[PDB]
């Protein structure tokens, strides 16, 4: 019970399967039916079914008796938390083997985006997709909300005719799809979407579901993705789930994508032209081990996921790519790391953090990724990758489709590695690595030399104040181009000119350019690329593109204010998980 956050006994009892049968309706803006959990009892003297809800409708709850009798049994609605929503305790037959509730979702769920047919590009037809991590699965399930509990599925959606429904499950139109996922996976993992799709494989076991004017872009994009999966199966066994899509959704995606089994729901801004961007498929072909093979069993434990899924991607992007796109990764990604040690609370910094009873989305931060790589990637460097790698193979077939806590993975990290291979790592750095702030200090610190020959030339002293610009610049990939950006000086204000009318970085295509260009910009003053600014957040709502822009921008009250008049007019099409993280950091 190493979790808050649940209502749900799971103490007692535990679902196994859950049979969904719902009806998309866009005109109410929710799902109705019901959710069969199939229940299975440890005590056996009598408990409730508890279950997690948010702002769901219940209609009536019935169970199966000793006999199989689906009898009506009654249920207590609790009075809803802030975070936790609304507790439902069901009093259910001693050892009901089954349990049906009938509801819907309403459209305050906070799982679930409903997007107007305008707010598509197909521009004809409405869109809906689910998010339910950490703990939304409740806004429109019925269910005990745990990564610490597994269920398969099997749902029976209904839609309408000439629109498509898709789900983290097996899809064997017309408006009657039927899914099936005979892997127990986590709730948060439970996905749909439901839309104007159209399909294109790209591999035998990969493909693309999107609105066409992206599909083909995106099938040009990530037709790399079938070398992710044969490169990570060499170091990390085998890809349990079969087959694996690629989900674009509208540009309103709040994230960069979410690792749903079998269909991972991607943003649109990665689709750059160039293949730049493409560790993030990478990055969420790597959940598919670590969160979502091996889940971690509370949300203090959410590095187990991010850590491990992060240094894995790095893998897959140097067994593709090559280690030098893959370190030119490293190091631009624990720049950030920096970044936000600094910004953040001297709490948050740790490994195994604590939520202080805040909201799973709040306390949210870039720690457990980075940190928890360069902790996985120091003892690389300790042991080496036919040790470390074996270990790490290990790990991944004997959690299969299990749940993990920090003090257990540190219990198997010494007796299969620190403890297997003795005197190399002292359970010192692994106490310091996950449960301190800030980095050990003796943590990894991934250099590039490219990047590197970059800060040597940044030095272009006053500006044009030694060298001209007649630098490398068509050579410069865009990690190359980050870095150059990145850790240019602060003061350059207007002094800035020569860089936005040569390379055009305000109207740069890739996002990232872009986003580090307003970034740099509004930093020294270059007050020149406000509306460029202004149509950028405006039309994405991905947050680690908008919301450090917000950050900065509402930091000068002057300035602070330009973002409120724009968030204004940005505000309505954000996804929900977007607007809340904006809302605060706009006071
Ligand atoms: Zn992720």
């Known amino acids: 019970l190493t979790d808050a956050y649940t209502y749900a006994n799971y103490d007692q009892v535990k679902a196994t399967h859950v049979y969904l049968d719902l009806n998309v309706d866009f005109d109410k803006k929710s799902l109705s039916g019901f959710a069969e959990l199939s229940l299975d009892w440890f005590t056996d003297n009598k408990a409730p079914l508890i279950l997690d809800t948010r702002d769901l409708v219940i209609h009536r709850v019935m169970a199966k008796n000793s006999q199989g009798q689906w009898v009506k049994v009654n249920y207590d609605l609790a009075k809803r938390d802030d975070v936790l929503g609304s507790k439902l305790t069901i009093n259910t037959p001693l050892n009901a083997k089954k349990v049906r509730v009938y509801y819907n979702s309403t459209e305050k769920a906070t799982g679930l985006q409903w997007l107007s047919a305008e707010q598509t590009a197909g521009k004809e037809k409405p869109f809906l997709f689910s998010q339910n991590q950490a703990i ?30 898709v789900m983290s499950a097996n899809n064997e139109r017309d408006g009657d799809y039927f899914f099936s996922m005979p892997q127990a996976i986590p709730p948060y993992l439970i996905a749909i979407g439901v839309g104007d799709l159209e399909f294109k494989a790209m591999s035998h076991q990969t493909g693309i579901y999107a609105e066409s004017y992206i599909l083909d872009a995106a099938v040009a994009e990530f037709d790399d993705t079938q070398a992710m999966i044969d490169k990570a199966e060499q170091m990390y066994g085998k890809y349990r789930w079969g087959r694996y899509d690629l989900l674009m959704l ?18 649109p801004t990665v689709v750059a032209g160039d293949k730049s961007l493409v560790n993030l498929i990478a990055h969420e072909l790597a959940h598919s081990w670590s969160g979502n093979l091996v889940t971690n069993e509370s949300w203090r434990d959410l590095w187990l996921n991010e850590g491990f899924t992060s240094y894995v991607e790095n893998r897959i992007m140097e067994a593709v790519f090559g280690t030098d796109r893959a370190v030119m990764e490293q190091a631009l990604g624990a720049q950030d790391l920096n970044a936000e040690i600094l910004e953040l609370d001297a709490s948050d910094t740790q490994l195994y953090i604590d939520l202080k009873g805040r909201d799973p989305d709040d306390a949210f931060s870039g720690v457990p990724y980075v940190k928890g790589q360069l902790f996985l990637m120091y003892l690389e460097e300790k042991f080496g990758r036919e040790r470390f790698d074996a270990f790490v193979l290990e790990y991944f077939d004997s959690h299969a489709f299990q749940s993990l806590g920090t003090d257990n993975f540190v219990k198997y990290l010494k007796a299969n590695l620190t403890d297997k291979y003795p005197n190399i790592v002292s359970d010192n750095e692994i106490n310091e690595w996950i449960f301190k702030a800030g980095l050990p200090s003796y943590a990894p610190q991934p250099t590039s030399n490219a990047f590197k020959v970059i800060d040597k030339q940044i030095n272009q002293l006053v500006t044009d104040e030694l060298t001209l610009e007649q630098l490398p610049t068509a050579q410069w990939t865009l990690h190359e181009w980050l870095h150059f950006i990145n850790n240019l000086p602060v003061d350059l204000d207007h002094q800035m000119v020569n860089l936005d009318k040569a390379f055009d970085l305000t109207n740069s295509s890739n996002a990232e350019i872009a986003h580090a260009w307003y970034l740099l910009s509004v930093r020294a003053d270059y ?26 921008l509402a930091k000068n009250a002057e300035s602070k204010a330009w973002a409120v008049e724009v968030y204004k007019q940005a505000r309505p099409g954000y996804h929900g998980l977007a607007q809340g993280t904006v809302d605060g950091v706009l006071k």
Do not use: C
């Open 136 to 165: 939304h699965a409740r806004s429109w399930i019925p269910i005990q909300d745990t990564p610490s509990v597994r269920v398969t599925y099997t749902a029976r959606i209904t839609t309408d005719k000439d629109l498509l429904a």
């Open 250 to 267: 509208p540009p309103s995606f709040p994230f960069g994508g979410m690792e749903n089994p079998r269909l991972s729901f991607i943003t």
């Open 527 to 552: 007050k020149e690329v406000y509306p460029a600014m202004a149509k950028y957040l405006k039309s994405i709502g991905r947050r680690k593109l908008i919301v450090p822009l917000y950050k900065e």
